């Protein structure tokens, strides 16, 4: 049967646990990303010389 789940906020950063043990908001990799409280995942602010 068709099922569906949504992850409302990708704010959990990365997890090194097996995927069966991870929270829905934790990913596997996150590089140069900013975990905002109200804007979700963002690019990290640019590095200004």
């Amino acid at each position: 049967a068709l099922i569906s789940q949504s992850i409302k906020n990708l704010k959990g950063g990365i997890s090194q646990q097996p995927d069966i043990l991870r929270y829905p908001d934790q990913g596997s990799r996150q590089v140069n990303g900013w975990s905002s409280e109200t804007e979700g995942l963002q690019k990290r602010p640019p590095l200004v010389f």
């Binding site: 789940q5 929270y23 829905p24 934790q26």
Partner: peptide
């Protein structure tokens, strides 16, 4: 009427 997603406040850290 298909079932709704269970409201999961969930959490973080190690599980």
């Amino acid at each position: 009427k298909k079932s709704l997603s269970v409201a999961r406040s969930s959490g973080g850290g190690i599980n």
